[PDB]
């Protein structure tokens with residue numbers, strides 16, 4: 696999971 | 700396009 | 704093999720599937736949650752959820768145009784997860800995390816359940 | 828928004844759609860090419876091809892279970908492109924590049940047409  |  | 708691969712292909716496909724959903728094009732099922740209705744594509748639901756995979760591979764249920772979820776399922780939690788299925792983006796917030804995790808457990812969306820568990824553990 | 832994003836989601840969705848195709852699950856159309864038949868999902872074809880997008884948004888054709896391609900279309904070129912749609916992998920070879928490019932132009936798959944043009948220009 697990432698900060699888009 | 701890339702070499703997978 | 705000796706294939707070449709287009710990096711952005713999968714993301715472009717999903718973006719186009721979401722555009723078909725927005726315009727209600729080729730949607731073939733209604734998901735009913737506490738009298739809130741969500742139109743979607745059976746194949747996308749199956750590709751994202753262990754529950755929908757099991758439902759639409761069933762010889763009788765594969766032909767249903769309406770699926771009713773368990774009354775304990777929250778429509779907002781479902782809506783957030785449906786958006787995630789079509790975009791890869793999860794709108795996870797302090798105010799919805801419990802509903803989102805409970806919905807992801809029911810829908811069998813293991814990666815979502817994992818990030819919810821981690822976000823909850825960080826707040827304790 | 829304040830969304831989080833699962834990097835591998837789009838690729839995982841496409842992989843699952845290809846698994847449904849392999850097992851012939853929820854395929855809703857047959858594409859006929861020079862008496863060679865290919866089963867697929869209308870939504871995936873639309874998400875990948877400007878031609879299929881135009882065909883399945885047409886009020887009469889959206890309801891067809893069989894689509895016949897132009898007789899000049901080569902089945903192998905189609906097969907390679909169908910595999911690309913479901914995997915992001917293109918089996919481009921000296922022996923098939925002309926058929927693949929002609930098929931991609933007809934199907935309106937701009938990124939495939941682009942890499943074929945570049946691979947051909949490198950060989951001249």
Ligand SMILES: O=C1Cc2cc(Nc3ncncc3Cl)ccc2N1
Pocket residue numbers: 749750751752753754756811812813814843844846847
């Ligand atoms: O967490 C998850 C996400 C998910 C998706 C599916 N889908 C499929 N699996 C295998 N072949 C085809 C399909 Cl469509 C099954 C289980 C789970 N569990």
Ligand SMILES: O=C1Cc2cc(Nc3ncncc3Cl)ccc2N1
Pocket residue numbers: 719720722723873874875876877878880935936937938
């Ligand atoms: O090269 C290409 C690939 C491609 C895909 C599509 N598909 C869609 N476009 C917009 N909204 C939904 C969909 Cl399904 C249309 C044109 C082209 N041209």
Ligand SMILES: [Cl-]
Pocket residue numbers: 751812813814815816
């Ligand atoms: Cl997931």
Ligand SMILES: [Cl-]
Pocket residue numbers: 875936937938939940
């Ligand atoms: Cl393309």
